Amino acid sequence: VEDPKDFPVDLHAFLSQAVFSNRTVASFAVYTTKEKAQILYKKLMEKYSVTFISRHGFGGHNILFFLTPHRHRVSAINNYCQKLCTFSFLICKGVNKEYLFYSALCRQPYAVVEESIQGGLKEHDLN
């Protein structure tokens, strides 16, 4: 009932709303439970050989942010993520603003719980 219908409003700027689009992208964000995000963190690594992935706390919920070496459809990533939820909510969107989205997720009200590279992203890695 009180499950979020979208990402927090302060992150909407960094996100594509075209969840059914045909355009393949390489930057993704997932909003779900801490339970489901803890699971997807590793499963996405082995599914999409992600170049970077980071997990970010927000109250009880989590935001996963990841980059893939090949482009994918957002609907494809979401479909995979939806398999590993059942009754848990899950919001999956393409990220149009990679290092800035990430930096918002590294500051209040968010916090980085874990990430696949020590020190996380450097802005020069994306540029």
Swiss-Prot record:
PTM field: Phosphorylated on both serine and threonine residues. Small t antigen inhibits the dephosphorylation by the AC form of PP2A. O-Glycosylated near the C-terminal region.
- DNA-binding annotation, residue ranges on this chain: 8-123
Q: Which regions form coiled coils?
A: none
Q: Where in the cell is it found?
A: Host nucleus
Q: Function of this protein?
A: Isoform large T antigen is a key early protein essential for both driving viral replication and inducing cellular transformation. Plays a role in viral genome replication by driving entry of quiescent cells into the cell cycle and by autoregulating the synthesis of viral early mRNA. Displays highly oncogenic activities by corrupting the host cellular checkpoint mechanisms that guard cell division and the transcription, replication, and repair of DNA. Participates in the modulation of cellular gene expression preceeding viral DNA replication.
Its domain comment says: The J domain is essential for multiple viral activities, including virion assembly, viral DNA replication, transformation and transcriptional activation.
Q: What do we know about how this protein assembles, alone or with others?
A: Forms homohexamers in the presence of ATP. Interacts with host HDAC1. Interacts (via LXCXE domain) with host RB1; the interaction induces the aberrant dissociation of RB1-E2F1 complex thereby disrupting RB1's activity. Interacts (via LXCXE domain) with host pRB-related proteins RBL1 and RBL2. Interacts (via C-terminus) with host TOP1 and POLA1 allowing DNA replication. Interacts with host TP53, inhibiting TP53 binding to DNA. Interacts with host preinitiation complex components TBP, TFIIA and TFIID to regulate transcription initiation.
Q: What's the protein name?
A: Large T antigen
